[PDB]
């Protein structure tokens, strides 16, 4: 999709419960010596002072176009309207720290107005916490 590849997500707020479906990613950047990477996605409601909202998909080894097809749920509170859903793809490494691969983020309020669905461009770690860029086709 651009620089760091793209990911297909679905996310709609339907209770005070936030539903997110991580489907698959494409054209991820190789973060390993063998020209590949072992991606997994981390979901978090930010800011998260106590580190209590971290959810994570399974890790898929040796691939740059993973298919997780995994879903998650977040119980929401009124204090969560100002927070953002953080979606980061990381590369699992055994003998060193994992390598950041790409990210995005949606404002909870944003998702309440209209659900997210489709391909999104993967951004850098710092900017990832501030916005998302959808991709058509
Ligand atoms: C028992 C070990 C096992 O299967 O994988 C070890 C891992 C994860 O390795 P990589 O996924 O980065 O790639 C493996 C690789 N370096 C590559 O370039 O693909 O950690 C390392 O950085 C060391 C990796 C070695
Ligand atoms: Ca790596
Ligand atoms: Ca790895």
UniProtKB/Swiss-Prot annotation:
Result for mutant: residue 56 to A: Loss of phosphatidylinositol 4,5-bisphosphate-binding and strong decrease of membrane docking
Entry binding sites for Ca(2+) 2: 32, 38, 91-93
Highest taxon above the source species: Eukaryota
Result of changing residue 90 to A: Reduced phosphatidylinositol 4,5-bisphosphate recognition and impaired membrane docking. Loss of phosphatidylinositol 4,5-bisphosphate-binding and strong decrease of membrane docking
Subcellular location: Cytoplasm; Cell membrane; Mitochondrion membrane; Nucleus
Binding site for a 1,2-diacyl-sn-glycero-3-phospho-(1D-myo-inositol-4,5-bisphosphate): 40, 90
Residues reported in the UniProt entry to bind Ca(2+) 3: 93, 97, 99
Membrane-crossing residue ranges in chain numbering: none
Residues bearing PTM Phosphoserine: 71
Effect of residue 54 to A: Loss of phosphatidylinositol 4,5-bisphosphate-binding and strong decrease of membrane docking
Boundaries of every C2 domain copy: 3-120
Binding site for Ca(2+) 1: 31-32, 91, 93, 99
Listed result of changing residue 40 to S: Reduced phosphatidylinositol 4,5-bisphosphate recognition and impaired membrane docking. Loss of phosphatidylinositol 4,5-bisphosphate-binding and strong decrease of membrane docking
Family classification: Belongs to the protein kinase superfamily. AGC Ser/Thr protein kinase family. PKC subfamily.
Biological role: Calcium-activated, phospholipid- and diacylglycerol (DAG)-dependent serine/threonine-protein kinase that is involved in positive and negative regulation of cell proliferation, apoptosis, differentiation, migration and adhesion, cardiac hypertrophy, angiogenesis, platelet function and inflammation, by directly phosphorylating targets such as RAF1, BCL2, CSPG4, TNNT2/CTNT, or activating signaling cascades involving MAPK1/3 (ERK1/2) and RAP1GAP. Depending on the cell type, is involved in cell proliferation and cell growth arrest by positive and negative regulation of the cell cycle.
Self-association state and partner proteins as the record states: Interacts with ADAP1/CENTA1, CSPG4 and PRKCABP. Binds to CAVIN2 in the presence of phosphatidylserine. Interacts with PICK1 (via PDZ domain). Interacts with TRIM41. Recruited in a circadian manner into a nuclear complex which also includes BMAL1 and RACK1. Interacts with PARD3. Interacts with SOCS2.
Record's protein name: Protein kinase C alpha type
Organism: Rattus norvegicus (Rat)
């Amino acid at each position: 999709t651009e620089k760091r590849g793209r990911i297909y997500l679905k996310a709609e707020v339907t209770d005070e419960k936030l539903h997110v479906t991580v489907r698959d990613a494409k054209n991820l950047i190789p973060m390993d010596p063998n020209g590949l990477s072992d991606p997994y996605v981390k979901l978090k409601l930010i800011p998260d002072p106590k580190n209590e909202s971290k959810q994570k998909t399974k890790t898929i080894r040796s691939t740059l176009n993973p298919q997780w097809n995994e879903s998650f749920t977040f119980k929401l509170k009124p204090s969560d309207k100002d927070r953002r859903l953080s979606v980061e793809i990381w590369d699992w490494d055994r003998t060193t720290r994992n390598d950041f691969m790409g990210s995005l983020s949606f404002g909870v309020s944003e998702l309440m107005k209209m659900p997210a669905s489709g391909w999104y461009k993967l951004l850098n770690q710092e900017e990832g916490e501030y916005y998302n860029v959808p991709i058509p086709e």
